[model samples]
Target chain A: NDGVSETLLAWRHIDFWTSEHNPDLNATLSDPCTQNDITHAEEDLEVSFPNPVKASFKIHDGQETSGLFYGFQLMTLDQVVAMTQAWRNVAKNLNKRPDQKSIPPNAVQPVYAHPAWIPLITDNAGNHIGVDLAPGPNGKYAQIITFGRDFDTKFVIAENWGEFLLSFANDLEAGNWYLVDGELVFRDKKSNGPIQDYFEVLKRRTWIKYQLERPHR
Target chain B: SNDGVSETLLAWRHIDFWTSEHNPDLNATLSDPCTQNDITHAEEDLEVSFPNPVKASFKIHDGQEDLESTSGLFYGFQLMTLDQVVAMTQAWRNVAKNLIPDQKSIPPNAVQPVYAHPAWIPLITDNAGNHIGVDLAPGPNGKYAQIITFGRDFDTKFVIAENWGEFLLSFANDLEAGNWYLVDGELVFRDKKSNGPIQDYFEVLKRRTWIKYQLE
Candidate 1:
């Protein structure tokens, strides 16, 4: 009656690189909602709330993923593009071709959104939990934002959701939850970059809160 | 002429917290606009975005202070009262007269929304960067929801409007920027507890993307 089963331990260390030539930094979490404990597991492999939460405390779920947890900064779309250019420039400088077959372990992937994406990291049981988008808005970047566990384990998800839950276990114990994703970057103060950059593009198109605040009110 | 001038800064830390003995363990960006360069000045207190950002990013700006930032744990509510009891039982309670102060110093002398009733926090500063009066709210406990920015150095005509616009910017940026809050204690992962139809209720409540309201 469920989509998938994943057995993750209570505590785990996840790492990611925030810069082009930097080594992955380690993030720590204590209690996490693992694949081992969901009824609809894969499809329901999500966490949401009854209403919109203050974006303030809500974005820290990605701290461990970006290594800028406590001091996450916000980024603009141009800034995001600039960071990507830097990463790409560094890769090119290393003589790594776009179509290289035997890629080194350090070879980075370009950031693209469409057709839904998720990371390939797995739980203790060797089950790939979800894809994590480094330098994304929050700790992990998952595009499809909805309520309930509506995610297909194979379709796509953010990598930081697991780590976010792990780092902020106390908040989850409260009834406050979020089920949607919006365009906001939970950036690290040090990098001057966006951990998540999708919203930066949207911000350039239209004012986000326009419809809600001024809808004939 | 304008009563007071407001300037914006590139780097500002916006935060939210859960109001329970148990940690809510949920944090996400409220809003991230104006880089460390967009707003920068020496005497600048804080700046507000001219028009606002999108609802998904700027919910706080338009005056939709969702309970989510409070870590889904309202001042008047909690998943388990046991934590409070345990603290009280052990003589470690600091709620004093059933009221808890905003422990974090982001909004000094002001307990940011989640810990108070009506979920409102006083702006606490003005053009001169002076402490203002209390911004009230209609929170479940006391003043559940309200916004206040009391000025201390005004010699001419004292008003809340001067600080109001400045305060609005803090929240507006919240709508688009990411957030983080402090928490203590352990949150366990248990299949025994029911997640319930959590998503259905959330969608219904937030049927609209963003909301804005003014309080007198």
Candidate 2:
């Protein structure tokens, strides 16, 4: 209800933009996840999602066709549950997992398998773009973060899903990315400027503390 | 004070001068330093030791932050954090170990052909799986901590610098002297010779002499 309706309007622009400009790229979103789907996933994953993610799930079960979000498929409801559980299993033993990285109070913690995070998209390389329900002191309730198995250094992607999705819709409309033979390609670097700007703002406030090598230990 | 560590700190002083609060080219950030224990932990798992300059630079800033993924701070390469160094280095090492342990086990005189090397410690990234790292297991006539380039989609590689200090100093020099610009606050390093933005890193780096790996 917050920015979901505005986000939907942007979602409406995706088809409109593609239809008008990209010469029938045919890039489209998948079917929505029924409310029960989210409920079942939430029960399994042990986290309650805010409205932004719920609305995202309501829109589609993470694109049936990829490139719905620049070639990174929106993860299915099941993918989120499975991936989160898999990570939880991996992080079960602290000794076995990679060293937990420390970030500023405003960013996502560089730890895997927190109950608060909800995976929204996947590059399928054991990495993902997800929402962090449990955030740092300066982080929002639905702040998005880049996480997954290999993300030892996590970055806060945005304040919420509404901002994230709205930007995606706007970036798409800017035609910064285009289709080539039905495949997605960026016009140049800086196409993902929204995420960059948000991160820069975060950077202005947040300074990471890399654990120094202590002497006389 | 003449140690390579000091040399790195000096280069950083210059970097601070260029990107500091009032430079108007958008400041490049340096994070807090890393502990000796963190370095030792990374070395133990990585099976390689960090060069004095490498360790010192990391200890100074723990690698650059506020790094953009596609277009990054250090000439389009984001200096990685200690944790990132550990994770990325291990990932690279596994490629060598998985391919064939014998590749690295070969005599120092022999040549090696492989996707990734076991002893290459990744120092910076473009977040596109490409890295500029330090080579810890170089062959004969190659110094232990010489800088090299190797990462995903990168089949052929080369030595970009003599050592970590040289690499650090060179990167700092490029930014300070060259015609770099801040497009929307993003540091964009341009080529001095061609006067073009430093994109297509593979092309720019290859011109500096490919110090081929003596393995296989």
Candidate 3:
């Protein structure tokens, strides 16, 4: 077990997922998932969920928070498996050699995919925030990673899930997230003024720097 | 008048007509418009400072009431309201935040940087939703701000103009004198006369019509 499960557990009590767009939605913790579900997903995906992830999912499958993940919802265990397979399939097709002659000359070459990477959420733009099973320098198996237009060049977001949670919590406390007309709005902390769209915060190199420097909780 | 000013005036006329035909609802005069505060907030929010010309242009004419004409670069200026700009920037920022690493490693000639500040509002957009906007970020060579273009793919970032003023003047000149032309998949612009000299060109992507901005 790594920090991911513990951090998720810490988030289990919050109602961050509830919104007007999804009023009936209850907290994932309300109907906490079971070990059986985790076992089933592992069997279906042919991959193992990290201990923290398994524990957290057992207590809460996942959530769907509006405007939370760039207008995309978080994935449940089965959804994660399904989405990964679909993404992998597309990657395989596009990376197929010789048969596709129209590929751009400058396109980055594809590499061997590691099955240990599991998708956690998507931003509705064909990009995903995922978890790496392999440990990093810190030797934590639950480091967060991002895969998108440059899936071939994944970036490590957090050394472990716990650190990601702490950063997210820090952002929330710093007024990075607020309610606007009952909808969630992301403030621009780097600029030190005005409310901006969540995506804007992500685009700036400064925000990336902030993430890189965020100390693990 | 200098060619830059004359061309810009011509382009303004063309743009006025384009807006009239394509975005009639956006032609309304603003009673309450963007202010210094709005610009400041926008600058801070986008993490890039706006050039004087861009601020002046928006102050004179607020952004588009809504996104218009899904295609065509500079068919008309879809001046985004400050709120609209914030929203659009936020949307693109999401893509920028999680982008693949090593932007420098990408072939500069092939892929453009789509992850620049969202404050680079799109003054012009093509039929396929690709857009050209005011890029507030300084260039590697230390220029203040430049005009850049990108698409929904968020893969490539293209430098359209060396500066906002130059870009505006160039387009206006292009429209007034027919200096810019579409050759197959590329949109090529020239200096002064139609066949004078190739200023630059762009390579149109598959989804977006026309490509190849071969800049000199």
Best candidate, TM-score: 2
Q: Estimate, for each residue in B65-181, the C-alpha lDDT of model 3 and write its tens digit.
A: 434342223433334566766667677666544434433212132222334343346554443455666654322221234566665544556555555556665555555666554
lDDT of 3 at A29: 24
Over A1-89, each residue of candidate 1 has an lDDT whose tens digit, in order, gives 01111111112111222221223322221123332322232233222211111121222222223322222222222222333344334
DockQ for candidate 2, please give it: 0.01
**lDDT, residue A6, candidate 1:** 10
Stretches of candidate 3 above 4 Å error?
A: A4-9, A16-30, A64-70, A98-114, A134-140, A150-153, A189-192, A196-217, B1-216
RMSD (CA, Å), candidate 2 to true, equals: 23.1
Provide the RMSD of all predictions against the true structure, rounded to 1 decimal: 26.3, 23.1, 21.1
lDDT of 2 at B23: 46
The ten-residue window of minimal lDDT in model 1 chain B covers B137-146
Question: Candidate 1: interface RMSD in Å?
Answer: 19.7
What tens digits encode model 2's per-residue C-alpha lDDT throughout A1-217?
A: 3567755776678657756665334444568889898888877764567777788778767655545566667777887888877766654444232754435332454355464566788877777778875553334446777776666767765667777777777667665665654766544345443333222333333343122312212
User: Tens digits of per-residue lDDT for model 1 on B92-125?
Assistant: 1122113323222112212222222111222222
Task: Assess chain B of each prediction and give its TM-score.
Answer: 0.18, 0.79, 0.56
Ordered list by lDDT, greatest first: 2, 3, 1
Error of 3 at B84 (Å): 63
lDDT of 3 by residue, A1-217 (tens): 3676547645643345443233444432235578788788887775667665665566556664554442445677767888878765654554343121101111111222334457776766666767765322122345676655444444555656566555655565555655553555667566667776443454343246646655643
**Among all candidates shown, the one with the greatest lDDT:** 2
